[PDB]
Amino acid sequence: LTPSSKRFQPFQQFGRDVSDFTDSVRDPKTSEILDISPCSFGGVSVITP
Amino acid sequence: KCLDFDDRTPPANTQFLSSHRGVYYPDDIFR
């Protein structure tokens, strides 16, 4: 969860990505727009002689 | 009360072209 940068429309609450993923949110209880990004995920690979 | 209007011209229902009018934001989603 990170703070959101770009200015939302007052009615617009959730920011959407090109692939329709949600990358920003509006707090329902408090009021602040937050940027949303995925947590890290890779694939471990073992190098070995 | 609710007085009526007398000697009223018909509306005549003329038409004008809409152009690029009638656009709304369907959802409250920022993009």
Side-chain angles (χ1 to χ4, degrees), chain A residues 7-8 12-16, chain B residues 25-31:
Chain A
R7 316 146 171 205
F8 272 43
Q12 285 177 341
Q13 52 205 115
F14 311 144
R16 207 138 297 187
Chain B
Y25 300 83
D27 47 12
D28 38 29
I29 301 304
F30 176 88
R31 284 181 195 93

Side-chain angles (χ1 to χ4, degrees), chain B residues 2-22:
Chain B
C2 196
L3 57 146
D4 190 22
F5 280 164
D6 318 313
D7 309 342
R8 291 207 292 191
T9 299
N13 281 26
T14 42
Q15 158 249 297
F16 279 82
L17 295 176
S18 168
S19 97
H20 325 299
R21 301 234 175 281

